[model samples]
Target: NYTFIIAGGGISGLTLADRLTEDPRVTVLVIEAGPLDRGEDGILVPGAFSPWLYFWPGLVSTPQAGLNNRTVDVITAQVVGGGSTINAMVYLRGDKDDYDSWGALGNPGWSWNSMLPYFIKSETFTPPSPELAAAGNITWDGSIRGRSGPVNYSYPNYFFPGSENWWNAANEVGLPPVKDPMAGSKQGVFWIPSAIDARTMTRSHARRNHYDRVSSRPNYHILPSHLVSKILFRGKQAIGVSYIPTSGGNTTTNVYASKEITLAAGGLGTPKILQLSGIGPRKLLNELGIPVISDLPGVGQNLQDQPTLTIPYTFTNNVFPNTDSLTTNATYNAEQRALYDSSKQGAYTIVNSLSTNIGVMSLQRAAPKSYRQIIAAARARSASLSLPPGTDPAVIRGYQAQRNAILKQFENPNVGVGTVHWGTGSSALVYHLKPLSRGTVNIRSTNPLDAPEIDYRTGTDPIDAQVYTSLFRKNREIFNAPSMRVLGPSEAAPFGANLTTDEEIYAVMRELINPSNAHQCCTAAMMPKDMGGVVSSEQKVYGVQGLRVADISFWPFQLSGSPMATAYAGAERLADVIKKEHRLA
Candidate 1:
């Protein structure tokens, strides 16, 4: 019998298994529902078309109540590493306050002070040179970080000239400059780093970083494309699992475990796994004529995530759209690279790092009371101070001022805001990291192979939607800040012509708000049952023995930062804890 059984071969599971394998005593079995795809399917593409949007096994779209009955595509990877295979590879963590706030919601040991070591434990950062650091090349707070980790976290070797323009415009729009966002002091625009091997120029997905290196070990068995149907249990104690090797032409299999079962299938996959195994809302299970094993009303309650969006601006000059164009800038006869080669890193160095660092801004630089001051007071006394459905003149005026801030940034010639081709035009892609509205993902039946129904009820929470909308406007404001505003007309005249009006801007804001495709996570959440949690602080599933969840789903709130880095770190910690308990120490 195996010492432990981990479901879902994503980053968390694969990383934990790798760590556990370090000790020879534990026999770990990983069961993944997707195949071990090896060719182009396995390559981590950093610059693919819509790289931020698409993933394999392709995700099923979910209906949202607030999005006017529109369905948003919920994308996640089905292969070994899950979304890690398609993620933007932004290797950053939440601010200290982000975790400290979790304690306010009744979670312990999640504060920055408590979780700092985990952050460090997962990193192997490439130190930046004094020149680069001074050039804002790469800066990180080491006190709260782990330097000797398995993941190779570093900044892109290549930099783009246009990014300076993006930064300039961002400031012109009203945002400030942040030197190092991940250094526990995130507040402004700064260069972003990622988990990548610059030599290969590909992202470090879970399997790539952990599993692929040691898949040959006999003590560890990886069963990919094997869909787990349910947990095998005696009474409330989980003994093993019932799974099927779907990629092997519909073959079924079972694995026994002597110790524990860990679910790392993530927010979307984990909850459905639990529900299929007789652990979920009992009323719903009973309605489907399935036996009620454990009534976990919170199994799939808090479905929190962030949306994606893009806004364009055209420049009169010519600029390369993709990275390769810059590297291979040549004609049919006499081909030649760019006149300057800043670093031997070359143009094809996958420098999307510029996108992460340049045009980005934070919405909540300060608490509402401190940042929005006057508006905060009005909101406190009202039932809800958010603008109602219709457009009002006063509301329009305030938002207009916000828009003017964005346009003015482009107008500032000093601002290094866009690509060198900014003399022509460009577009801004804004991302909102924090969301307040919550939804649920419940199971439809007892079958494990079936996917859960995820209902976000997005945009319904006025506070969440209003905050998001304001954040979008804030993106424009930051781009227009005085220090960076340089390359544009004093006023944003679309195509060097008439300035786009506030009404037009607002119309675009409504049109541009995309679906929270990141689905960063919070399903089998961590909280008291009364507060809607499927697991306890120890990551234990309620009413289940020898079973635990250690995925993003355990996150009770949407992380104010990226989730992958933290998820990997959290899984490592859990793996160690489980190893100790099982005497695999």
Candidate 2:
């Protein structure tokens, strides 16, 4: 028996294990569903990305009925390092109010100010070059950044020249410049950093930053290539867990946890295991033939995700370097490969999409009256979007409180409705950040191996449709700005340049917008128990003992930035919470 058993050795699991095992008396075990990435180039190479880098058919979602019965792919990194090993490597910290709103939602110590120390504790920030700094391409506040931390965050040495045009377009429009997005005042376009090792120009994931650093500890152990089937419970108490080798045999092994078992299996993985263990809604578990354990209706109800729509445009000049040229031309590929092999400085070392400038704008700023009208319409139908039926009455009360807080954030000017990711080359991926329509992630059957039904009611809300349409129009104006006119970019496939009306653009969006940005979150939210909270402010499962969730699932609401950096900071903080509770420190 171990003092702690961390299920799913992803970003949070590894971080928590590293911190908790620092005490010699505390023994910890981490079980991972995927193999250790020992010699994987697709994951090691800075700009190289492929399907093999992630979990093989990782975690495919059931059909999204909102998107015309089409199922959107759920990209879960099954590797030891999790999504950090397979993601785009963009390191973004959401706006300040995003966390403050969480604090207002009954979770104390979750405010941006309270969470800043943890954020600084997990990252080691590296500034950009003098040349880039002189050109105003890189701007930051040193006081607000972490100088000594585990995860190394640095800007790319090289970027596409077209990025300059996009930056200029932001200036031409009324959008203010965001000097440091990581400082909690995120908005406007800026040159963002990546989770990269500057010395080698390769990805810097949890394995390298958290696990490898403490692998020598005798008290710590990691068992890879093992899938956890369910949590072992003894009459309302989480005693241990059961698992089997991923090779697909019926033989299962059970391990006991003497102290506690933490579920860091990400937003989707955590909830799936919880339901499989019969900790979800009683009605659903009864239907699936699984004996109910906790009867928490909020287990898989509050599924939130970002929806992305791509807008492609053709540049008449076509002179700028892009990912297309590297793939199509052998000569160009060889030259870049040689440059990177020698000095770690070339297009091959840089992620081309780093040039995708990000801007967070509130609906009110984009279109004032239109934004208000959209909010009004959503509020009018708010009753229809109420909590799931079998939800605890206390959870309903909490949802009401959260709803008011959400509406207040909408009124706040600092809060944004959506984000715009404009790539200078072929296309732009616009995002609907604050999606009003909620969905579910429930088990289709009792089998733990089965995939969950992920219904992200994408574009169901008029607010989402209206906001994205406004942003798409704004993106077109930016492309046509005087600075961008030199390149002569025009709308291409999906929609012709002649389609100028809202009706024409929205029709294209409805057909093309991807329902999932692979940023699924908030399945087992952390709030008051009465308010549909699966976990408490301390991240403990409401009706169970010795069990807690410590991943994106614990987030009461989705943050404005990517879940990567924030997940690290959150894990580090949670480790401290566990340490203090047990006097492990």
Candidate 3:
């Protein structure tokens, strides 16, 4: 029998498994829905994209009104390694205040300092090669970076020459290049390191570092291709779990856990499991004919994601070779293959050279001309705002508090609200950092195999649209700046010169906005029980015993960047807490 059973062997699940199994006597079982990665290039190559099979199938969202009634894909990982196995390897961190808000809101000991140690412990930092470091102008703080962790954290061996010009252009718009972006306040340009092992030139992710490191331990066991259906509880305490094979099986298996069961099934996956086990909103459970176990209103509520758009641009004085040349030039493609096949050496080592250098800035820095008016309007709207119909009073209360916290950050000049994800010379990933809009992830049927019905409900809040309009206008200025004008950049989509009016921009956002950055989170928020919080400060589900959440679902609000790094840090910290509480001799 396993001492502790983990549902979903993704990044966080694997991490907890590794940490909990440190004691030889404590056995841990990890049930993953997907199969092993099998060393595919899509997973191992630093800049490679994931194969279709790596993703969780049938997770598309319900038609979203914000995106012109289009049903967007709710992309999430299904592999044993989860997102760390399929995501862009960039190891970007959010603003320091991002975590401090957790402490300020209700949870104590969750400030940036309290969580910084875990962020440091998840990766082993490696400096860039001296030649590339000098050529690329790479900068970071050694004191803050991890050096003895398991995951390899290092810079790419090469960067596009034009990558250096990215920040120079940012300066023209008052977005300075940060000396140490990891210092917890990011409002400008920074060269982010990727999850790559520079020496071996392979992806450094949770599976490789956490799972593979302890896979052979006697106390550790992982059952891949099996999905956990529900937590089988005895009255009020969780006893074990019932699971089904992912490969179309009719049989179900029951496994017992001696101590506890943890849900590390990511932002979307975790809530589905909880709801199926009758621990979600009583309304949803009653409708599905599942008896209510906890009646927690926030189990599938408070969903948040960064809505981004990929705006393509064509440059006149384009000196750098296009990173996408491999698609058109067969010879270059073959050469890249040769270099990578022969000991993982080549320009292909860079994780999207076009995305190597990214710039993020506060709304004030991005739209200095109208930021005040936008905030004033949002502040006024928030005062009299009513959320979408059918929103739980508790969730509305939580979102109200959450919006105020984010607005406070928006007022700061160093917290990012808009991000310009640019590389050598292709397109910019125009990203909105903190969206006021909230969504839901609910089960459609009683079957655990059924995919959750998600409604991103983006732009339900008027402020999101107002801020997006200003961000689009700011892009026009950044391109027209003297430093960037030399490249003669021309807008292709969404930002057509003729589309100057706010209506025109809003129309384009409605038609072309990508509703998520695949960083979906906050479904099971950590806050006070009355605020629709699913879990408490201790990470335990309210009104439940021996069950907890330890993943992106714990985030009460938004972070300023990609949620991957934060995911790792949060899992590491949770594992340490469990270790202390469940000590073994």
The stretch of ten residues in a row with the least summed lDDT in candidate 2 is 382-391
Tens digit per residue, CA lDDT, model 3, 360-441:
7887887787888877877776522536667778877777778778878878887888778666656777888888888889
Please give the lDDT score at residue 461 for candidate 1. 50
**Native-to-model Cα distance after best TM-score fit, residue 311 in candidate 1, in Å:** 0.9
Error of 2 at 417 (Å): 2.9
lDDT (Cα, tens digit) per residue for candidate 2, span 167-283: 787678756678888888665777767888888888889988889988899998999998888999999899999998877777889999998999988877899899999998888
Model 3 ranges off by over 4 Å? 342-345, 383-386
Ranking by TM-score: 3, 2, 1
| TM per prediction | 0.82, 0.95, 0.97
Clashing residue pairs found in predicted model 3: 96-184, 354-423
Residue 359 miss distance in model 1 (angstroms): 6.3
Please tell me which model should have the higher TM-score, number 1 or number 2. 2
> What would the TM-score be for candidate 2 when compared with the true structure?
0.95
Model 1, residue 24: C-alpha shift (Å): 0.4
Count of clashing residue pairs in every prediction: 43, 6, 2
